[PDB]
Design an enzyme around this catalytic site. Structure first.
Site, PDB file in Angstrom:
ATOM      1  N   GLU A 163      -1.803 -29.390  16.566  1.00 15.41           N
ATOM      2  CA  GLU A 163      -2.042 -30.717  16.008  1.00 15.41           C
ATOM      3  C   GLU A 163      -3.524 -31.064  16.021  1.00 15.41           C
ATOM      4  O   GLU A 163      -4.087 -31.463  15.002  1.00 15.41           O
ATOM      5  CB  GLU A 163      -1.266 -31.770  16.803  1.00 15.41           C
ATOM      6  CG  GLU A 163      -0.199 -32.493  15.999  1.00 15.41           C
ATOM      7  CD  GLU A 163       0.543 -31.569  15.057  1.00 15.41           C
ATOM      8  OE1 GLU A 163       1.362 -30.762  15.540  1.00 15.41           O
ATOM      9  OE2 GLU A 163       0.303 -31.646  13.833  1.00 15.41           O
TER      10      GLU A 163
HETATM   11  N1  LIG Z   1       6.869 -24.670  17.133  1.00 22.16           N
HETATM   12  C1  LIG Z   1       6.054 -25.523  16.457  1.00 22.16           C
HETATM   13  N2  LIG Z   1       4.745 -25.185  16.287  1.00 22.16           N
HETATM   14  C2  LIG Z   1       3.936 -26.096  15.585  1.00 22.16           C
HETATM   15  O1  LIG Z   1       2.635 -25.747  15.398  1.00 22.16           O
HETATM   16  C3  LIG Z   1       4.429 -27.334  15.053  1.00 22.16           C
HETATM   17  N3  LIG Z   1       3.695 -28.295  14.352  1.00 22.16           N
HETATM   18  C4  LIG Z   1       4.324 -29.471  13.912  1.00 22.16           C
HETATM   19  C5  LIG Z   1       3.582 -30.565  13.155  1.00 22.16           C
HETATM   20  N4  LIG Z   1       2.983 -30.161  11.904  1.00 22.16           N
HETATM   21  C6  LIG Z   1       3.719 -29.713  10.824  1.00 22.16           C
HETATM   22  C7  LIG Z   1       3.328 -28.452  10.289  1.00 22.16           C
HETATM   23  C8  LIG Z   1       4.021 -27.864   9.177  1.00 22.16           C
HETATM   24  C9  LIG Z   1       5.133 -28.543   8.568  1.00 22.16           C
HETATM   25  C10 LIG Z   1       5.854 -27.905   7.379  1.00 22.16           C
HETATM   26  O2  LIG Z   1       5.551 -26.723   6.973  1.00 22.16           O
HETATM   27  O3  LIG Z   1       6.786 -28.517   6.729  1.00 22.16           O
HETATM   28  C11 LIG Z   1       5.539 -29.831   9.112  1.00 22.16           C
HETATM   29  C12 LIG Z   1       4.842 -30.422  10.231  1.00 22.16           C
HETATM   30  C13 LIG Z   1       5.713 -29.667  14.177  1.00 22.16           C
HETATM   31  N5  LIG Z   1       6.438 -28.708  14.869  1.00 22.16           N
HETATM   32  C14 LIG Z   1       5.846 -27.549  15.316  1.00 22.16           C
HETATM   33  N6  LIG Z   1       6.654 -26.657  16.013  1.00 22.16           N
END
Ligand SMILES: Nc1nc(O)c2nc(CNc3ccc(C(=O)O)cc3)cnc2n1
Ligand SMILES: *[C@@H]1O[C@H](CO)[C@@H](O[C@@H]2O[C@H](CO)[C@@H](O[C@@H]3O[C@H](CO)[C@@H](O)[C@H](O)[C@@H]3O)[C@H](O)[C@H]2NC(C)=O)[C@H](O)[C@H]1NC(C)=O
Ligand SMILES: OC[C@H]1O[C@@H](O[C@H]2[C@H](O)[C@@H](O)[C@H](O)O[C@@H]2CO)[C@H](O)[C@@H](O)[C@H]1O
Lengths: 252, 263
Positions: A163
């Site tokens: 993030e």
């Molecule tokens: N395991 C894991 N590792 C991360 O780095 C991550 N980042 C986010 C927050 N950011 C995003 C990134 C990509 C996407 C999309 O492609 O849809 C959505 C939200 C949420 N869960 C996550 N879970």
């Protein structure tokens, strides 16, 4: 493969050490001239070999016990992590990672995907109340190290690194956290831009390089919870401090 | 590969001087009607739809530059009969609406209500600073630079240096105007001005007059670059004690980095 890696030891760590650490991680996953308005666009499956498909993050807790989690260069995702001859992969876990990450340890896959909702649901709590910071980071690494690595701890890491890797707002939010050695919980904003990485991503790819207005609007949120819709890039940057774009479309 | 998508027309506002919006005089959709600065608000004459072809129009009548030559004002006229080149516009992230063919940019000589706009020699002035958006309200933010310190405002005509961050001191509360300028939230009457276009040039908090020195572009790299002079604002020698931020050749170093944090 001996995927490259960046480190960050909480012990004797200053706000600057963290800031620098994140930079390095960016210089890694973020490569390839494709970039708009200065911000890079993380490569896509097709344009990325397995020899460079993952980057490792070595996080050392206060007590020295350091845990390492591999990020997916094609999205800055926490693909997996390992602690003393032990490796864990989400319910998903593709053969690519399962057959290239931490080879030699015990390959026991967890029981919940990396999806935010998936974690919050497994941790029994939502991001809005999983306070991040210097100490929260120590407990995180610690829990992943000993306790095997539960959801909550992972949720604490995901935001603190990936993030903050794409959002400088979160970066400074943590930078001040270690600076004042005090914790904090994600606010409506931080959480909003956290959920709008994909949206704001293509919104910027749509307008294109050197283009300010957005063909649409990004649905962010203020602390009071009221909607904060940004229709231009200048706004998106001055607020989310975004530093990493996700691929969605190619220029036109 | 995977080609993007052709965006449809969207309506947004346009601000670029003392928080004033751009609109059609008296909201008359008649041809020849000039464009002027005017207090924002819910009104078609103020709303502008952007098209793929590169046009901008309110009430349906394209926004063309009328006559063409440094000093030629802008107005609205039927899209069809509209001079091919006098209707195409460009909106770069530099906060400027340049007219392709010509090379002149929508300049606002003065920022007085009712002030008519006009194409003029792009020189990089707050007058020639515009931001298209539906939210004509600037965001309050602290400019945290070197050593997690917040940029502080002192007195009128006085310098501006890094002081210990304080989310309460209004002297650290910066209001980012759509005209691409940075003024004190407390008193949006004085903009972050520079004293010159050479390195080491001292920055201060002079009055707002649209000067080319009060035009700040927030580079996506984290550096607040002065548009006229490619110089960026940094912490002189890094020694925050010197109490002075200046313009200096981009080095890509932290002492030139700035983070704009919300309220
Ligand atoms: N395991 C894991 N590792 C991360 O780095 C991550 N980042 C986010 C927050 N950011 C995003 C990134 C990509 C996407 C999309 O492609 O849809 C959505 C939200 C949420 N869960 C996550 N879970
Ligand atoms: C930045 O400075 C500007 C002023 O230059 C502030 O604008 C306005 O400030 C007032 C006072 O907080 C806000 O509310 C007002 O409350 C009084 C008291 O009830 C009332 O008499 C007024 O009619 C008004 O409601 C106002 O919402 C705010 N914004 C606008 C557009 O008027 C601004 O608040 C300052 N921002 C920060 C973060 O300090
Ligand atoms: O010219 C300045 C400014 O004034 C307003 O114009 C008209 C408006 O179009 C009309 O509907 C109303 O009845 O009277 C206004 C008189 O000022 C607009 O608000 C603005 O866009 C400019 O047109």
């Amino acid at each position: 493969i001996d995927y490259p890696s960046v480190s960050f030891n909480l012990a004797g760590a200053k706000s600057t050490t963290y800031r620098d650490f994140l930079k390095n991680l960016r210089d890694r996953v973020a490569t390839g001239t494709y970039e708009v308005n200065g911000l890079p666009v993380l490569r896509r499956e097709s344009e990325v070999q397995v020899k460079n498909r993952f980057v490792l993050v070595r996080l050392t807790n206060y007590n020295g016990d350091t845990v390492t989690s591999a990020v997916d260069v094609t999205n800055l995702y926490l693909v997996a992590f390992s602690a003393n001859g032990n490796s864990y992969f989400f319910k998903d876990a593709t053969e690519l990672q399962k057959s290239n990450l931490f080879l030699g340890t015990t390959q026991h896959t967890l029981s919940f995907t990396g999806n935010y909702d998936n974690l919050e649901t497994a941790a029994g709590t939502r991001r809005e109340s999983i306070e991040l910071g210097p100490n929260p980071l120590d407990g995180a690494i610690t829990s992943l190290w000993y306790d095997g690595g539960v959801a909550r701890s992972l949720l604490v890491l995901i935001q603190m690194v990936p993030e903050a890797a794409r959002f400088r707002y979160i970066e400074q939010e943590v930078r001040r956290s270690l600076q004042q050695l005090t914790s904090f919980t994600p606010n409506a904003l931080m959480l909003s831009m956290e959920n709008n990485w994909s949206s704001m991503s293509l919104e910027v790819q749509l307008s294109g390089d050197n283009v300010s207005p957005f063909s649409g609007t990004v649905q962010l949120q203020n602390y009071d919870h009221t909607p904060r819709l940004v229709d231009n890039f200048e706004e998106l940057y001055k607020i989310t401090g975004i530093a990493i774009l996700l691929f969605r479309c190619v220029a036109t | 590969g995977e080609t993007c998508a052709i965006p449809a027309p969207f309506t947004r506002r346009i601000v670029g001087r003392d928080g004033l919006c751009v609109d059609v005089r008296n909201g008359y959709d008649t041809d020849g009607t000039p464009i002027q600065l005017w207090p924002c608000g819910t009104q078609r004459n103020q709303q502008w739809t952007f098209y793929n072809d590169k046009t901008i129009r309110s009430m349906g009548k394209c926004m063309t530059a009328n006559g063409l030559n440094s000093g030629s004002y802008i107005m609205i006229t039927d899209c069809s009969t509209a001079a091919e080149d006098a209707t195409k516009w460009e909106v770069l992230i530099d906060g400027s609406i340049i007219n392709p063919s010509s090379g002149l940019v929508m300049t606002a000589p003065s920022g007085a209500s009712r002030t008519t706009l006009l194409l003029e020699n792009n020189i990089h002035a707050a007058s020639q600073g515009w931001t298209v958006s539906n939210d004509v309200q600037p965001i309050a933010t602290l400019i945290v630079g070197y050593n997690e310190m917040c940029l502080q405002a002192n007195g009128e005509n006085n310098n501006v240096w890094m002081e210990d961050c304080d989310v309460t001191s209004v002297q650290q509360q910066w209001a980012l105007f759509d005209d691409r300028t940075i003024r004190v939230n407390n008193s949006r009457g004085l903009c972050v001005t520079s004293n010159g276009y050479v390195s080491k040039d001292l920055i201060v908090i002079r009055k707002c007059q649209g000067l080319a020195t009060q035009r700040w572009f927030f580079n996506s790299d984290g550096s607040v670059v002065n548009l006229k002079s490619t110089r960026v604002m940094d912490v002189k020698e890094s020694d925050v004690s010197l109490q002075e931020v200046i313009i200096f050749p981009a080095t890509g170093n932290p002492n030139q980095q700035w983070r704009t944090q919300v309220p």
